[PDB]
């Protein structure tokens, strides 16, 4: 058994982190007070759920998590929330004033005087790990804390944990739920300083989650709660292999081996289904060929793009529910005959399939309806570069006039770090095109 530490940075990372761990407890049968009746080993044991949970003599199962926000309002919700009993105060760190949506303010100004504290709190969890695997870092691109402080935290973790893996769950900026004009600046600034330090990044575009909530769940104006309840469902499927018995993606090292042949292109596209509104009296339960078929519609991609006009470098299928390998292959065959799945000539054309029998657990009272089978596909498509081209484009529009640059220069950052970051994205778009286009 090997442990995994989850780190949540900024508002988005903390609230989303609050939604995942809520889901994790409903899946593993862990109550809000941290008690797990099904766990017969009291105060210890190297079971699969022990990768995300440590055990105390009193029988409490404690998440291996660390929340970090530069302002206490968002984290205080967790200290007095429903799952307040799971964590202890050490795991929750809060400053007194935030970064004001300013990467420079989250990385340099406020970051310098709290980094040694976050690391010290993380060092405390690593000590409880007999064989620590790596880190899962949740955060946002547009937030000043989720972007400025995270890129700094990553730089240090690579120093204090050189041999450990680091995976990202990033929130892509979407204007329909964003209140910040400079979020392009932050996204491009953080992706530049974090690239060499992240082994695998799952980008979730709020614009994508937003329309799935309005289209599949009939929410006319979704709230962050509606968005986080869904993002946790996806995250739950992507991390389930670490928390459950199995053989596919049993530790973080396999996420790179199974999804990142080229290091810089470490942004797998995600796809999940089915998403059914709980308000519907009853729905025709979809088969394996129907849920698998959905994984190639743009409507349930965590980022809106067109894989048909790209090339795949790897592909995983994570099933949960009443699924047998016989029906999985049957679906895949009929999908190849109808779909456009172009692989790079230097990578095999195949799919790694994993099946967990327990169906996806739904938050009682939430928006999602209980389904009998579901799948989450991870695809390293060059099509995801479209998201960069968009973001990089907006970056060009504002920086060409130097708008808002003074807020960053004022925090001590150098104006050259903008172009140095932009030139990096230009090279990232080039590598994406060298792999996918002819």
């Amino acid at each position: 058994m090997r442990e995994c530490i989850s780190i949540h940075v900024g508002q988005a990372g903390v609230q989303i982190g609050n939604a995942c761990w809520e889901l994790y407890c409903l899946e593993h049968g862990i109550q809000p007070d941290g008690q797990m009746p099904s766990d017969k080993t009291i105060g210890g044991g190297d079971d699969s759920f022990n990768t995300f949970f440590s055990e105390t003599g009193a029988g409490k199962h404690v998440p291996r998590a660390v929340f970090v926000d530069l302002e206490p309002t968002v984290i205080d919700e967790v200290r007095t929330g429903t799952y307040r009993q799971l964590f202890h105060p050490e795991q929750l760190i809060t400053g007194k004033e935030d970064a004001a949506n300013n990467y420079a303010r989250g990385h340099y100004t406020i970051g310098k005087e709290i980094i040694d504290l976050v690391l010290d709190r993380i060092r405390k969890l690593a000590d409880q790990c007999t064989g620590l695997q790596g880190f899962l870092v949740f955060h946002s691109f547009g937030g000043g804390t989720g972007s400025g402080f995270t890129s700094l935290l990553m730089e240090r973790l690579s120093v204090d944990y050189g041999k450990k893996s680091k995976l990202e769950f990033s929130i892509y900026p979407a204007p329909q739920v964003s209140t910040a004009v400079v979020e392009p600046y932050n996204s491009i600034l953080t992706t530049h300083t974090t690239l060499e330090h992240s082994d695998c990044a799952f980008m979730v575009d709020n614009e994508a989650i937003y329309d799935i909530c309005r289209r599949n769940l009939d929410i006319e104006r979704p709230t962050y709660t509606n968005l986080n309840r869904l993002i946790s469902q996806i995250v739950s499927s992507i991390t389930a292999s670490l928390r459950f018995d199995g053989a596919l993606n049993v530790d973080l090292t396999e996420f790179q081996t199974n999804l990142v042949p080229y290091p810089r292109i470490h942004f797998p596209l995600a796809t999940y289904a089915p998403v059914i509104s709980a308000e519907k009296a009853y729905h025709e339960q979809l088969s394996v060929a129907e849920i698998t078929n959905a994984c190639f519609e743009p409507a349930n991609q965590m980022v809106k793009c067109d894989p048909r006009h790209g090339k795949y470098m790897a592909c995983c299928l994570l099933y949960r529910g009443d699924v047998v390998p016989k029906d999985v292959n049957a679906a895949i065959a009929t999908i190849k005959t109808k779909r456009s799945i172009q692989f790079v000539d230097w990578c095999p054309t195949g799919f790694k399939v994993g099946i967990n029998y327990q169906p996806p657990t739904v938050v009682p009272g939430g928006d999602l309806a209980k389904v009998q089978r579901a799948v989450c596909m991870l695809s390293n498509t060059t099509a995801i570069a479209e998201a960069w081209a968009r973001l990089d484009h907006k970056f060009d529009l504002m920086y060409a006039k130097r708008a808002f640059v003074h807020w960053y220069v004022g925090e001590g950052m150098e104006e050259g770090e903008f172009s140095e970051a932009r030139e990096d994205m230009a090279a990232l778009e080039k590598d994406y095109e060298e792999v996918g286009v002819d």
Binding site: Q176, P298, K304, H309, R339, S340, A385, A389, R390, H393
Partner: protein, 350 residues
């Protein structure tokens, strides 16, 4: 009040749609970099599709199907036909063709010589033609050594196909010609054929014993008006339309344009588009696409139709700009942004 942008200043077809859009008083034109638009008349090469369909509360429409280059590029169309089972290497309406990379750069050199050596041995007509997309650069010849020696002198991808030695000649004159059909595809993937075609005819008597003089062999509107000495003699602008051409077919061959030719054209367009539909369809996409295509056909003395090439950014005949453009606005643009048929629907299975 709808809004649209323009990014292809050289586009003559859509320069009229924009003029008509403004004539309705319900369409506002924006600068070519204002992302808040309803309709984009985008640029030919390197149109940024990835940036379309991300403006909250705005339905966006673009006039180019992402992936259509698979059908409108010379070398692309060939590989698409031989590889696509919907067409197969045994397709009967597409001339036998091969993809040949210049020897300074897969490639089908040897497979071309095999079919070539088989013809030269069988006494059959063995005259081929070479061409490329980087041309206005074409060479017709019956010697495989000349064709291969001409492609190597270039630096782009070329294609060699069987030159139709027995083309249908119009009288009087004894002259070659081709047919241009304009096909429009809307967002629902309905395939409308413009009832009005044009026959860009040659004003020179077809001469099969001298491929060196390419004035009686190539029927491009720019070649006949430059290197032809009988331009405009028989018909105006070397453009015969489906009315005059339909009468001649009845006076000479005792058959109609609909039966002899138009049926085959309506089948070639169906099979070409239905093939790539799964690859370019914008059914469940964040944006919507529609593109005007310009098909070029050849007719032999047996009244059999062959496919030459497809044009993803074609130009229309002078006498058919008003009628067609208005049709584009009715079924392709206004069909999505309604305001306050000159096409022939080709029903198919989606």
């Amino acid at each position: 009040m709808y809004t649209f942008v323009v990014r292809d200043e050289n586009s003559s077809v859509y320069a009229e749609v924009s003029r008509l859009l403004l004539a309705t008083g319900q369409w506002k034109r924006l600068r070519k970099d204002n992302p808040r638009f309803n309709l984009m008349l985008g640029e030919r090469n390197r149109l940024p599709f990835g940036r379309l369909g991300h403006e909250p509360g705005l339905v966006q429409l673009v006039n180019y199907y992402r992936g259509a280059d698979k059908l409108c590029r010379k070398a692309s169309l060939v590989k698409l036909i031989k590889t696509s089972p919907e067409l197969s290497e045994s397709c009967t309406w597409f001339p036998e063709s091969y993809v040949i990379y210049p020897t300074n750069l897969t490639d089908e050199r040897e497979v071309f010589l095999a079919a070539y050596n088989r013809r030269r041995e069988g006494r059959e007509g063995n005259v081929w033609i070479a061409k490329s997309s980087a041309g206005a650069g074409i060479l017709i010849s019956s010697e495989a050594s000349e064709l291969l020696d001409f492609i190597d002198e270039q630096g782009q991808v070329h294609v060699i196909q069987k030159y139709l030695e027995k083309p249908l000649l119009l009288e009087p004159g004894h002259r070659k010609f081709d047919i241009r059909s304009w096909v429009l595809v809307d967002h629902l993937y309905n395939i409308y054929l413009y009832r009005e075609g044009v026959l860009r005819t040659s004003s020179e008597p077809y001469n099969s014993a001298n491929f060196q003089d390419k004035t009686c062999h190539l029927t491009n509107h720019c070649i006949q008006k430059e290197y032809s000495k009988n331009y405009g003699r028989y018909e105006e602008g070397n453009e015969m339309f489906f009315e005059e051409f339909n009468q001649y077919l009845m006076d000479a061959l005792n058959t109609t344009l609909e039966n002899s030719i138009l049926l085959q054209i309506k089948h070639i367009i169906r099979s070409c588009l239905m093939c790539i539909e799964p690859a370019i369809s914008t059914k469940h996409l964040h944006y919507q696409s529609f593109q005007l295509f310009g098909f070029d056909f050849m007719v032999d003395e047996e009244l059999k139709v062959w496919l030459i090439e497809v044009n993803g950014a074609p130009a229309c005949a002078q006498k058919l700009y008003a009628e067609l453009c208005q049709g584009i606005v009715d079924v392709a643009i206004s069909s999505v942004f309604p305001l306050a048929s000159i096409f022939i629907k080709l029903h198919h299975h989606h």
